[PDB]
Symmetry: C3
Subunit: 243 residues, 3 copies
């Protein structure tokens, strides 16, 4: 179980076995919600398309892919112990919210993922990153995970796009793995939630497989109704669209 | 302890003992919120007036009562192995929503309540039956309970109307039992209190009423004027007796 | 440990220890949200300024300060067995909502807090007190706590104003302790909650120490980012101290 350099909080690695049980083989895996990368990091496709709306994430990812050593070194500096108090965190939050340089921002992004309350990633209405200090014991610099991610990223393209656009890049050689924000028990709406399904139906008819993960509820069974459904242990659901 | 042919609200009928404990005697039992029918099914008044606002329900019950053998036969057909899969479940749900045949609707309805997610009854904004496939091991066709219902229905009338109208059918020899939709932790709080206000009117005319709900500040507020009884278990449940 | 004479649903008491551990020393302790009085009852300042938005409360307190026995006498009369029923509760409550006499009102207020659902203080939108009968097996008359409250009162001023006014009164020799309505998961707002933390910034900046207590949250940590913070497990409580 290769870990992700980022917290989500990470988040977790349940389901992983089950996702791989039902994930069908192919050349290229297309992920319209990469998030922390956990599935990508734990699979062996020849080739990966990975997308997400959060541009801070994609930008980090391309940098880790293209400038690995220079990235690791600049990031490492600010895991020294002088930077582990409320006074520094807030100064670094502000710098990040005011920076226009993508590189510097990716370095600071890392530190905030690791020193901030529960590894949350959150913006206020002015679109500033607005998570407070976590008061963490001893954070951990993820040097190995960084390198491991960048080796793997050499067969990965990353795009800042929403699900319909990333989903439109699959072809017959592709498989598609979907991890939308969870159905309920701004944000991602139910209209979008049902829209993802239709896209899935559109793709499977074109002979491209699609697997979707979500809570098990009334709404999701409605949405995923034209798919093979496996329940797993609230319960999770894995909707498979096999041609 | 007789069961209802329809899968109930959540899981109920452990309250039946406290209901029968606190339910006064008389000739007729009026039930403004009949639902699946279990108080009716496990009680013994000489007649019943049974009401509900869902007209799929009241139709079904009028057809179980008046066309009993033809209904049971036709329904049993649908409870096979062939029909226990999404493909068919969805096909039958669409038929139901498109149909104009009260008979055939009553049929599909039971299948949908048996093969459907948590045996729920729900409609979307367009008024169409809305519950997804329930993925059950193998569903049980309620043959005995269908007949029990039908035999018991011979002393019943079914109405499709609202708590206020059904409650005004009650009279000197009546007794009212209400089982409104649950208070919170759509049926509005204004109606929730209206129900307790009509109860207060009934008892002034010497017509006992008993009402059932969760135990909360609000239920307690609305039923101020009834002797109150708390039933444990997951939270407590309240029974409010208005007695002359 | 002294108890308040007023009931409350779920706390103030559990944390006194942790609080007194972190409460700075000084001559006067100021309390924007006095509530039931428990830190005030269990600390030993020279003088106290005690404040709350609820006029019924401050008024009750001023009356207990100045008319002790005349108060305790009238209040005892209502803790008899003849009163522990819904007939009487609703009667007393209605008299409270209709009385314009402070003294009669404050005697009733105590009946309502000890005989009502969960010791709760609520009002409808017409300002009427709307808590129902709490159906209590037997309610205590807190005589000892009343007298103890009166005794300490001699070193206190009660004000009915809002958090900012009452904090504007703190001075070189003061300590402020804040216990706002809790952060979430016509009431106290987020903006207000963030405003309290600012006034606190201003106060420490003038060498006035401030202690605030709340749940441990993403939100409470944002607001109190400038305080020295201490989690206390029991979700967790947060204590934020602004020390010069
Ligand atoms: N409209 C959208 N199109 C494409 N991607 C979208 C869209 N809306 C939201 N997303 C992205 O979808 C991702 C959400 N994912 C994971 C988010 C995430 C995990 S670790 C991490 C670290 C940094 C940033 C985000 C994340 C949520 C799935 C999980 N089952 C849950 O409900 O919590 C997240 O990256 C978010 O940015
Ligand atoms: N204004 C109304 N007047 C009379 N009846 C009403 C009114 N509004 C709603 N109702 C009906 O009241 C019935 C409610 N029943 C709910 C049972 C139910 C839910 S889905 C279903 C399918 C078949 C049979 C019963 C049920 C009361 C039980 C309990 N208090 C609860 O809701 O948890 C239900 O049939 C609904 O259709
Ligand atoms: N804006 C305000 N300014 C001053 N005081 C305020 C303001 N807003 C609310 N308050 C007062 O703040 C008091 C808060 N206290 C209420 C304590 C109480 C105990 S017994 C009793 C009987 C009557 C009234 C209050 C209480 C609750 C804080 C807690 N952590 C929570 O949210 O549950 C409460 O009495 C309320 O009247």
């Amino acid at each position: 179980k290769n870990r992700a350099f980022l917290k989500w909080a990470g988040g977790k690695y349940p389901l992983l076995d089950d996702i791989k049980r039902h994930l069908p083989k192919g050349e290229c895996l297309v992920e319209p919600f990469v998030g922390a990368g956990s599935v990508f990091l734990n699979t062996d496709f020849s080739r990966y398309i990975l997308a997400d709306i959060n541009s801070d994430l994609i930008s980090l990812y391309n940098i880790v892919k293209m400038r690995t050593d220079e990235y690791v070194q600049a990031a490492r500096e600010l895991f020294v112990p002088e930077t582990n108090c409320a006074e520094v965190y807030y100064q670094f939050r502000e710098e990040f919210n005011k920076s226009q340089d993508p590189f510097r921002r990716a370095v600071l992004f890392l530190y905030l993922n690791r020193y901030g309350y529960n590894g949350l990633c959150r913006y206020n209405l002015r679109g500033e990153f607005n998570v407070p200090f976590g008061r963490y014991k001893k954070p951990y610099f993820p040097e190995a995970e960084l390198y491991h991610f960048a080796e793997k990223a050499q067969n990965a393209f990353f795009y800042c796009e929403s699900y319909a656009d990333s989903m439109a890049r699959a072809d017959d050689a592709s498989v598609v793995y979907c991890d939308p924000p969870y159905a309920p028990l701004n944000s991602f709406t139910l209209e979008q939630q049902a829209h993802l399904a239709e896209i899935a139906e559109g793709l499977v008819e074109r002979h491209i497989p699609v697997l979707i993960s979500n809570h098990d509820t009334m709404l999701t069974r409605e949405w995923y109704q034209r798919a093979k459904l496996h329940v797993v242990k609230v319960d999770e659901l894995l909707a498979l669209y096999k041609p």
